[PDB]
Amino acid sequence: PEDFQQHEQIRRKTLKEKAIPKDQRATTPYMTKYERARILGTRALQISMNAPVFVDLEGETDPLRIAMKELAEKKIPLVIRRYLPDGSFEDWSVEELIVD
Amino acid sequence: TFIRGPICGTDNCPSRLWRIIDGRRTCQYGHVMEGDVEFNDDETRRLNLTTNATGSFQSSQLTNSQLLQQQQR
Amino acid sequence: DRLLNSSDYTQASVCRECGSILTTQQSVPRIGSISTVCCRRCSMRFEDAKKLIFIDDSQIWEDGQGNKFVGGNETTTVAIPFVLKYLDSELSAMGIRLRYNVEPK
Amino acid sequence: MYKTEKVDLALNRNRGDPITQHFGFGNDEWPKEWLEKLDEDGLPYIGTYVEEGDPICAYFDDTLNKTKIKTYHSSEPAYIEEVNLIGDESNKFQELQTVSIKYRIRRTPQIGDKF
Amino acid sequence: SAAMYSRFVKSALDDLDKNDSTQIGIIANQVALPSKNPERINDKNLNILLDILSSNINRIESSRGTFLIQSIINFEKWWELPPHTLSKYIYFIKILCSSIPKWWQDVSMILVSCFILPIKQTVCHHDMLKYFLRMIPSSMGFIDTYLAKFFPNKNDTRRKLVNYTSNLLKLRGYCSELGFQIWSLLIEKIISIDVELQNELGIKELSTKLDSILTLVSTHVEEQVTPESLESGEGVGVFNTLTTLFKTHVLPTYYTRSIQYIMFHVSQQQLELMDSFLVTLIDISFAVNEAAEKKIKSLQYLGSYIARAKKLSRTQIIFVASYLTSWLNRYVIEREEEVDQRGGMERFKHFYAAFQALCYIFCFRHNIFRDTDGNWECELDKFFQRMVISKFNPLKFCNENVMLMFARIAQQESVAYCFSIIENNNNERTRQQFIDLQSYFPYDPLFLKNYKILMKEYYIEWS
Amino acid sequence: TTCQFLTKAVLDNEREQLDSPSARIVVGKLNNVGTGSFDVLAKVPN
Amino acid sequence: TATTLNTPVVIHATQLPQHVSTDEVLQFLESFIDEKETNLSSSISQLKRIQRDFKGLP
Amino acid sequence: ARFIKKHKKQVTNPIDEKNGTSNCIVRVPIALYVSLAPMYLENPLQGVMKQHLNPLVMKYNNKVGGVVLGYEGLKILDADPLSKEDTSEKLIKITPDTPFGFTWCHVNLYVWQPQVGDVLEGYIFIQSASHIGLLIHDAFNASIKKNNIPVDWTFVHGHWVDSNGEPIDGKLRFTVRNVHTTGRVVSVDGTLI
Amino acid sequence: MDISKPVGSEITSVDFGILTAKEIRNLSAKQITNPTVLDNLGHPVSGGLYDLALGAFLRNLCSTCGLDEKFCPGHQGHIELPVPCYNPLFFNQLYIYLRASCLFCHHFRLKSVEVHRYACKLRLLQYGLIDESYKLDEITLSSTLLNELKSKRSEYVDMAIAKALSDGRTTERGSFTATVNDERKKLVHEFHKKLLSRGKCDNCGMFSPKFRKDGFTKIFETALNEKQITNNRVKGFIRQDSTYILSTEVKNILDTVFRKEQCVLQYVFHSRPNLSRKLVKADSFFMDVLVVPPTRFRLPSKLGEEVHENSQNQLLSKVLTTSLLIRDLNDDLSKLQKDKVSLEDRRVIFSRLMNAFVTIQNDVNAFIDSTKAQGRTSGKVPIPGVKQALEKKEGLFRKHMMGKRVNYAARSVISPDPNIETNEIGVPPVFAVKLTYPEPVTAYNIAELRQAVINGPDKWPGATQIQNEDGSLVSLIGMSVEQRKALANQLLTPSSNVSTHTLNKKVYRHIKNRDVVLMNRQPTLHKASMMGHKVRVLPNEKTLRLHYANTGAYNADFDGDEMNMHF
Ligand SMILES: [Mg+2]
Ligand SMILES: [Zn+2]
Ligand SMILES: [Zn+2]
Ligand SMILES: [Zn+2]
Ligand SMILES: [Zn+2]
């Protein structure tokens, strides 16, 4: 059991080391088109398997058209983890990315 | 147009497990057999195998034994 | 989608110690509880386990020959194509193993 | 477009065996909508309309004691123009082991037909 | 035989100590034969085999005796032995499955699978389960899988369904800790036979398959809930698991009417039940969080229940119909300025279905509405005339046939005027899942026979 | 030539690290270029 | 039987276990069945029979 | 050289005092990598208990070693390693191909574990000629078989009668010989000698 | 693939290795002994190549796990061998370390500090330190002189390793980059050339004899020379404190070398830090056993109506027959007494075994490869081996792993249509019936999935399957209207369980005007020739309809061009 706890202190200390803190995020402030497609991909996979939707549907039936609508009000509760090729990452929320 | 077989691997039948709803086998009342797919080989020493049913191999040409020899005499 | 999901996509199983996909089998049950998945390579013969404390009860299994075994129970299931499982067969004829690392450990 | 398939059961016979299966109807139960498309010797009526699933010959086996069947395989609905009864060039063997059916397939100018 | 066959099995048990076990293996082939075969071990030979085992079970707990136990427990028609060998076979299981408590899960697979027989042949099956499900208390869990695994199919025989249903209701009778999953088993399965029948409105099989099962629940539950089981027992528990499965199973399924009749039967046992069954249909017909299709479908469960429930009083019925008329009056306060707005009439489809309940209640309980004094209830003249002169117009968008019957019994009392707007209809000249939803009344006359005979307690007719 | 690159890699006990888009098709992971270049986390409350 | 929708994929014991005395077992057993009141019922029924036994009531 | 001795029960069980019996109820803190459905995205603590900790109540699980009674203190480990412990919005990694969230957990499992060589005292609910049937703590089944019964003890029609000539009933003290855990039910093999 | 069953475990790295002889004999089930494959009845022999512990066959059950032929994974068995054998892929790296060993000194014919130099360069190059490996030439100043050169070299390696770990320059698992991978291929190419350019043994002065090979793994040990025995016998005092050579004596010298040459051969076969400390053994070049594939990877090859033997069963047959000619002739010399045997009878047995010790090895060379075996039956286009299925254009890697075949895809002739949009495609009603899409049931589409189940499999828009909450499919093909409406009203009914209390029914709806396809035209030159169009379902045709604005991208001309379509 202690050989797991000694193992777990490594994995948490590495992920704390890899994570770039919030003030130093030097990547782009935009939503690249590979990020927008996966946000509407995963959010439409959650609406389809009964997640709570945060908008009013207005008679839509396709789960892609709901998650397209929910991005237009910045209600999507996801977090993008932009990897750098050393291992590091920067948690950018969806609400703070300029979609274009 | 059917083919007899097991009942079903569920309690929700009896049936004679009819033939191929394309790809897999089916019972009468709907339930697709879960799970096996029809095999096929699209492209020496000749053996005594008679693969016929769903691409799987069957046995040699001895039938139920004495009936071919009782009815011949 | 075109090269894993809609060609083969077999959810196989691996061992989390020897890391192979080909040496796992369903143990035939005892008296008649549920069956469980076990691995041949990590396991010992049970009489060899009695030669080296009491051996636990839940970590014994048996194949369809009645032979007992201990160990080989740490296993999970991953999602691979099937042609990997054919390749692991073909490489073991040449004497080559392909040990996998399956995370989380 | 015409198209000829040779219905055969003289194969797999191992050079000296008795006539294991015969043409013609048996005497046990058989589902009796085979009679709508097959004549009473196990050969189809000339001019019928075959689909994928209809029978083309009904050979009654003996070593399995059952009124078997042979089916149309291609998915295109064809008619039947000619059936020939080929006899043996060698000696007797005379239970009609080789039959030749010719299907006539309609080809109307569709969309996608090269001119 | 009397002394040699006792020494024969004792010389079979002796070879067990020397790991041989072939005269065990022959005698194991002797036990597990069919009962219909005269090559079997007879009755007095079975007496000799069982007391030499019940004397000492502590020798055959080996890996090489597991065919000996398996030959015993798979005794084909074991319960049809004479009762002097039957009382020792029964006494063997009460020692085997308590000395070695790993063998209970195999015999419990047999005692539950053999419940496809009528109750008068499995009287010793149910005595053993009430013993072991209190004495192996951890076995209360996995037998729930065993109940649902062997339930017969909806296209199986009429023999197997009704014998399996009636044997389960015996198991409901004493294991109150299971409770939920038995009622969840049948109501999930009787609904699987019911949605065939509404489309028939293989008929003669599927109709007579369910009415035997649907009677055997209703006659059982009218005995289970009683006046001495509400204030003193657990009849409030039988009601709640029946009313929480009406909400979860019979609400979301579509186009059914034979299963809500079991709540047309339990609810009429007392008066506080029909208040609680009413308050069940109230807070789901008005809660704002659900979609409209549950507030529409439950309002049809409100209109067609109160119209057909035999035991009712104005101290409930008018007092909710007073607040219903206030719920309409508070609906014509806010949204009668939202009737000229940019939008369609679909915004008040909840209202016309709410108003539909009033023109169904009026067609069946109008002689109740007359008080002693000779005045109507809650200013009907200030109500039935007032709602139709608005721009809402609840004659056009509501039902065509069950509301036209109301406009005959409206002008049999002249309480309102609505035929000139019918003359306005032919003057002025997404929805299909709702248009065919208000044409659905749950408690219409049943097409079955036996359950209509049971329903002359409290079901009324159109007369 | 498949045997040549195979016999060099076994004699070296070379751990493949699954980074090329031809290695991830063999094993059956998600690719690295394009949309498989980040992770999407969810934000659950409490 | 058991997919990964009702099974953890691993369980690892982080620490060594600590032997707890009965008076805190009764405090845990009290405060657990209060907070657990659909398939939990047939487990907490058996748990109700345990807590009566520790205080001592046959 | 090589050891497979890591199945050893590392904590021995004490003997309670003042009594003659043991204590076999422990508290072990575990960590576990669970799944999480896309419908419990607003109640993730409620959704882990309803999906992964409730099927472990009152059954056997060999990783903790005994029988799990219950749990306390479920804390979802956060995937954002710069947040604090007082936050109320934690992050959970979503699988690529599927919408099912996967995560870690920390929780305390109260386990009742018996071992070979301990003293247990339990009730009697059947006395037969070949065993004595036993319940421990009115939940778990035990047996004291005939070959482990001492030779100076007698039977009568029935109930067993001791060396001095009295019936035995109720709380019969014994020591453990084996713990059988094969099927879906625990089994404690006892011994009186 | 199904989005209701998720996986939790992920594969991250595929380490390699060699299957060892103690490894296979554990995991195997039933050792294959019998050279035949079937008995007379049409049934597999208990011990032959179709054994029922190697996979369920015709209708039986697999004797190890006990499942049907549609549930058995298969298991692999093993053939025993009395001779070890030469592994025909690991041959030239055995052939190089043969011609560099000293048969007397039991070391290499190179020096003792030159080898220790190449070890200490290869250790630092494991950790990526390309600089300190090159500064090891900068350490140079008899008996204790070479134990002072070896001491400061190993201190300088240890000083550089622990300094490069104080910061994050490297880690204990070791870095490896394509630049660090380059220098390893230059040292090893130099360390193998320096071992093959030796004459006299530079450790103890002796002269080692010659070896020379053939392609069929025939090596002939050449005897010595008179000048070199003259150096051997006069150096017999300091060391005082063309016959065909078989397999087992070559084994016996190489365990003796590899026990002594650990600290240099540890780093030749390791491009990463050895954390398990698995010692290198010379058994890793010799195939003591032979793992046969499972029965399911050895099914007979149907051709028309006949059934032929599997081609790998033939190459595994001839191994097993020739292993019975030797195993009889092994016990032939032992049952016959060793004093009764003459000088001729020991020499006529030793001209029978030496012909059969070749043909056991020239069949392992035939089972693995086809080029590296004998020229048989005048061309004949011979039986391909194991390597021949793992090869070029039609092999395994370039036909079944990089480019596959797909479900849910169609192809037909194209035809023009200007009356649709530029971003559309005209799907005819013969593709709009067979192509489906699993669309799960929630509250917003239950209005439309009821109407799409009632419509049945042969009316667009319709559906062709249901799927229950536990994976159990229910088709709709044969069902009539009162049975489809029996299922259409039961889509949202909860099925009570504790496992699947989250999941819900997926209906396999038809393709619609909402969906998106992925057209394609072979040959696909540039990436703008695999586009994605929105479906527009047209009636009364059989060809795909396309707008003219997309005929710049696919290079299409409407005279018989065919285009795929995915989904
Ligand atoms: Mg062209
Ligand atoms: Zn079926
Ligand atoms: Zn393993
Ligand atoms: Zn198998
Ligand atoms: Zn030396």
Numbering used by the authors:
A (entry chain F): 55 to 154
B (entry chain Q): 3 to 45, 57 to 86
C (entry chain B): 1090 to 1141, 1151 to 1203
D (entry chain B): 803 to 917
E (entry chain O): 48 to 248, 324 to 551, 581 to 614
F (entry chain A): 1617 to 1662
G (entry chain D): 12 to 48, 80 to 100
H (entry chain G): 14 to 170, 215 to 250
Publication passage describing the model:
A final cryo-EM reconstruction exhibits an overall resolution of 3.5 Å and shows a Pol I early intermediate PIC (eiPIC). Upstream DNA is well-ordered between CF-interacting regions and entry into the Pol I active center cleft. Following the canonical DNA-path further downstream, however, no density is visible around the active center itself, but ≥12 well-defined base-pairs can be placed on the downstream edge between bridge helix and the clamp-head/jaw domains, even though our scaffold should not extend this far. The twh and linker domains of subunit A49 are detached in the eiPIC, agreeing with a proposed role in promoter escape. Within the eiPIC structure, re-arrangements between CF module I and II enable Rrn7 and Rrn11 to bind promoter DNA, mainly by phosphate backbone interactions of basic loops. In the eiPIC, the sandwich region tightly holds the promoter in place between the wall and protrusion domains at the bottom of the cleft. sandwich elements contact both DNA strands, therefore rendering it specific for an un-melted duplex. The TFIIB-related ‘reader’ and ‘linker’ elements within Rrn744,46 are mostly ordered in the active center cleft of the eiPIC, with the exception of the residues 46–56 (B-reader homologous). Assuming its active orientation in the eiPIC, Asp629 now allows coordination of the catalytic magnesium ion (‘metal A’), together with Asp627 and Asp631 for which we observe a clear cryo-EM density peak. We also observe, that the Pol I cleft continues to contract downstream of the sandwich region, adapting an intermediate conformation between the Rrn3-bound and ITC/actively elongating states.
In bakers’ yeast Saccharomyces cerevisiae, a basal initiation system required for Pol I activity consists of the promoter DNA core element (CE), specific initiation factor Rrn3 and heterotrimeric core factor. CF binds a CE stretch between ~15 and 38 base pairs (bps) upstream of the transcription start site (TSS)11 and recruits Rrn3-stabilized Pol I that is primed for initiation. During transcription initiation, Pols are recruited to their promoters by a set of general transcription factors, forming a ‘closed complex’ (CC).
